[PDB]
Symmetry: none
Subunit: 162 residues, 2 copies
């Protein structure tokens, strides 16, 4: 699903739209042939894309392929929510650096669910009696967690960063 | 602080019944001598009083002294909060009978403080660990206790009546 639309700048500046959607890994000879570039692979720009991160018009094919490599080295669980993760981590460099400091709470839809997980099935505050359970303010604990950490809500659950 | 005005119903002086104020314990002989009752101590009634409870015109010296004994024997904090207790108990007699079923939470100002004590100090809901204590809804528990139990708020604390 990762793809970019690379246009010929020598034709676009004049008015004529000559480009194409390319998937990864982007091979230079294919681009050269498809949008009519020269031996130097000269004057192309990125005029549209479908990626989990921002890109400039003047971002090189080499930059793109490199980011694709880094994304591929990541575990599949992180790749499927990469866009959300790159909101906290501001770069793939950083995400990969701390990749193992991430916890995927798969069946949690909010901080209440995360609070109830740590208390009940983790024993984060020691064993809880039966009679006391209806008086534990999980909403309050989930709040104290969210304020004192980073929790990212997504379609594959809540991602917590240590 | 505690006294009653006892009138001789049969002895007048200057168009007004003979009477006097008496402090506790009300000495029978003193009364007889002061307001001039007969040898059988008859013909008297209580026409005024300064007591922390209600009492009738036809209440006997014996009953009064018995009420004084009962009040004096109560714990101090119950003594100073009689008016509040007698909105629950029907009489000093009944309060005295049930005095050992009254729990005096002297250190508690409201039901939160009472809930806090039962959970932390008593273990009424089992072992509450250190870190967990900071996230227990004590207002909720105190409200549940108040809705189903009997707790009276007073200036000398919360009194709880238990079966």
């Amino acid at each position: 699903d990762m793809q970019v639309y690379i246009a010929n700048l020598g034709k676009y500046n004049e008015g004529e739209l000559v480009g194409a959607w390319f998937t990864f890994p982007i091979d230079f000879e294919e681009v050269k042939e498809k949008i009519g570039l020269n031996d130097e692979y000269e004057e192309y720009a990125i005029h549209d894309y479908e990626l989990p991160f921002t890109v400039d018009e003047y971002t090189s094919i080499g930059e793109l392929n490199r980011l694709w490599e880094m994304v591929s080295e990541l575990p599949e669980e992180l790749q499927s929510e990469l866009s959300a993760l790159l909101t906290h981590f501001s770069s793939i460099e950083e995400l990969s650096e701390h990749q193992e400091d991430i916890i995927i709470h798969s069946d949690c839809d909010d901080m209440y669910d995360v609070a109830r997980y740590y208390i009940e099935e983790t024993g984060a505050l020691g064993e809880v009696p039966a009679s006391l359970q209806n008086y534990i303010d999980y909403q309050a604990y989930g709040r104290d967690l969210d304020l004192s950490g980073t929790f990212i809500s997504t379609n594959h659950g809540i991602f917590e960063i240590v």
